[PDB]
Amino acid sequence: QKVFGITGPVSTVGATAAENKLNDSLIQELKKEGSFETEQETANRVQVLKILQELAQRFVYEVSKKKNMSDGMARDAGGKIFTYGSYRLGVHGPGSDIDTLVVVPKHVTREDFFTVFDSLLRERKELDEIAPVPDAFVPIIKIKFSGISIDLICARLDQPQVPLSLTLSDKNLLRNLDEKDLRALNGTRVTDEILELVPKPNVFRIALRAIKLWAQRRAVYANIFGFPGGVAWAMLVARICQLYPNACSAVILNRFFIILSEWNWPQPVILKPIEDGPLQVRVWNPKIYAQDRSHRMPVITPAYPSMCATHNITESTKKVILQEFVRGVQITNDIFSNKKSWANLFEKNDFFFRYKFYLEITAYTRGSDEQHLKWSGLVESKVRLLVMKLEVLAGIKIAHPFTKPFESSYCCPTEDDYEMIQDKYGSHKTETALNALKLVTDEIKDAPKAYLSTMYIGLDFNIENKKEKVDIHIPCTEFVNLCRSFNEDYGDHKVFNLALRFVKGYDLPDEVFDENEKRPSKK
Template sequence: MSMNTPTYGVTPPISLANPTPKDNELNDLLIKELKLRGSFESEAATRKRVKVLNTLQKLTETFVYNVSRSKNMSEAMARDAGGKLFTFGSYRLGVYGPSSDIDALVVFPRYITREDFFTEFEKLLRERPELEEINSVREAFVPIIKLEFDGISIDLIFAKLDIPRIPKDLTLTDKNLLKNIDEKDLRALNGTRVTDEILNLVPKPTVFKHALRFIKMWAQQRAIYANVYGFPGGVAWAMLVARICQLYPNAVSSYIVEKFFQIYSQWSWPQPVLLKQIEDGPLQVRVWNPKLYSLDRQHRMPVITPAYPSMCATHNITASTQKIILDEFQRGTTIMHGILDGTKNWLDLLQRHDFFHRYKFYLCVVAATKSTYEEHLKYSGMFESKLRLLVQKLEMVPGVELAHPYVKSFENGYYCDSEDQVLNLINTYGTLKGEELASLLKSSKEKSESSNNTTNQQDNNASTNINGDNENLNQGNTNSDTTNDAKIEVNLTKLYIGLKLSLQKEGEKTLDIQHPCAEFFNICKSWPEYEVGKHFVQIKNVKLYDLLNDVYVEGETRPKKTVKRKRLVAKDDSKKKAKSVEANGTA
């Protein structure tokens, strides 16, 4: 290795070899596949994003000026106070597509408060004609304003630094900028700092970006892309790809993808994936260290952020999701062998997941709010963030081999005529009977994150309904908010967990999951804003052939029940019973 060759990462590269003609050919095909699938945005659409960001930067400066003047600062000082917009996530990494949102951070001087941000800055946003939708979530782990602005989805977070003004050329690389700020500000700053570090730690940014685009698309197609549900999120996938780029600094993107599957299918987990050595800093804050902290030792597939203070980006991974991820790495390795010998292509690697074909039993986990969609968003956000806790509790039940959470929610809103209809809808939502009832109701707004192609079903639903709000179902709030000519608005979210069972013990015929379900109900009900009669949580056992049509995308063939021919019952079989999931709740 030449003395002038820069090195990246915590170990020397595995190979400095340049790409072969075969590598270049596969790389051209990979980029062609990305283009065919609409991974890249048009230049006009990108210019529109830049225009929107420039508008938000001007609003930021106006906001700081207005607040500064209201706090008796001079005209000159208020004009000079600054305020700066930073981007992070997929937009900053350069791997965004036509439907991608923009993650943005606004940084303010020390005297601007979070309350100012959620009142005065939001007021400025609401005055803009480009604003289409806005939702503030002050109580989030990282407080956020979500908005649709001129057709672009933007997640806007806030941080203030302990400095009197924000210069236009400010960067966030200096660790001393993190002094004297609270934890929420620190978490907000972390996104931009991590993204910038990743870009600085890869040898060839264009190679990294194309490889990451492909891996992100693959992870989404295989339904293993969602930090909140126990899978790697966008930052984690970016760091995993970046590490492979460090090990093969002269490779093209197709070769990076090949080695991605080969290396991570053989990785010695829980050995961490690091892009640089973990650094100390000026703060009295916790830095990831499994030697010191028992919680860090429990991380199954640690991928560590490079910016101080280093954290584990994959701490949500459970025993079940780890197995699913490793199986997907192995599948990727097998298909890559086929791509290399010409029997497979990139399309095979990007084949859609089979989650709603794979298991005999599913749990349909439902959150409902008898109020507006905006009110429901607060509850459903908390609800979704707790699903992995239910997964972990299910993993501990004897007979549960795997508890596989699906990575997307399904949402609907309806107007009901009476309290009885509200309760009937909530009780049956996620079942064939509920689908039939919903088809008769007026939708309050189409909000599904998945393809909702619901049709009426005439079959009877044989699923078990475990009702977490049984004691409250007949105590509806007659004073609830009403819309649409005094009708009652109900918004619902459903999530799915696939169960792989292993009931092998003698006499073991059923699976009792009442205890983990009851614990999950209690977790949801302990939310500080939970209101009896307004918020509901339920878990329903649904068999494969009773899944609703809305979980299948257009053109996807739903599994069909095969009719088995009757046979004579042998003496040894006469005492056998079918295995089933049973939860001792209210049906």
């Protein structure tokens, strides 16, 4: 009965002929957008996962043998792989990664994973590429294997064996774990629970496929920037399915937009009663934590311990998400009246057209590809904080962050030319001045390189008093001084820099438009 959620259904009436009609065009539109891989590619994925399961057991077998153990014991020690995310839910597409978890017994360290298991991978003829990130916040090895992309992480359980038949439903498995292992194990516990809390998984899958495409298209899919991540969207679709257990997916979509657009935010969205368990624990409770009372559009993970997947949402992103829900309501109602089609729902956003002003955020590096990832990855992770400081000012109607950074690189070469880059980049009036420096495309003869990561924030202003107008340069310098204090090397102007530019929509850089568009200027 849990598959009907915490309030039971709004309706148990099944699809009508006319409703199923639209579902079939919904599937057909998804097919044309390329949502589904071929059935072979899926057979190939399953095959690669069967091979990884054997490697996990080898990995574990070998480590155990080095840790002195008998054959019986080493074989008993086990090791098992799980998948979560997109692939586990069954909503993956061509080129999507399989998110994969390697669970290991207590005598098997992370050093083991980054040495013994990494070696076992390279010994395979099928291994196309491997990129270990042992220093990672979330410890990972990213591979491409028989053409298929896999992201392997490792969780270490406080137990002597990991048998083939192990499942991770039991919260007893979490006592005694440290933070990394709790995080690594959480992804799978959540995905499995989502799947057991929807009444019809096929309906769920198609609805989700739709929301994902729609979210990417409307630029409302990006956890880092205060929009919902893939898991957040998943739970949101999951809730509406609990409400209409016998509806087709097209109805789920229509209903999804109405219910979510009218929802009493910040009332949380919850798929099963929140539970508590062992220790003070990181459970979501707004009656206890201030951090939790301030969540704007809370959507709560079902697996103990429950957590808010949409922590990053701001005032400005809340407003964007809702605008899009409403757009979602209108267009879908029109589809059902035959006035519009599915394509219209999935049109690309027009972000670089809808605002008179844009604020431009550039991370600069004199160094290597390592150094830029580190530097830009930080600044990027801080954009929402600049949004929160902007959005609460008197003069600002909205501060809307775009969801994808824009990246570029040049051979520098000398330290004179680097300052020129941080002079002429980012305005179209003076932009081609950089054409005096070689840009990196494909492809090589390359050495000393300057790196650029640009993020965009659309800005919209309230009418102001002519005597009382808004200044943004205070939270901007506040923001740079926020970033120039996260490891001391970032103070080195010789290498790291951070430019903020206020730029009008007509003055926007060309990089920002498709091979479809252009932006006639105001005068």
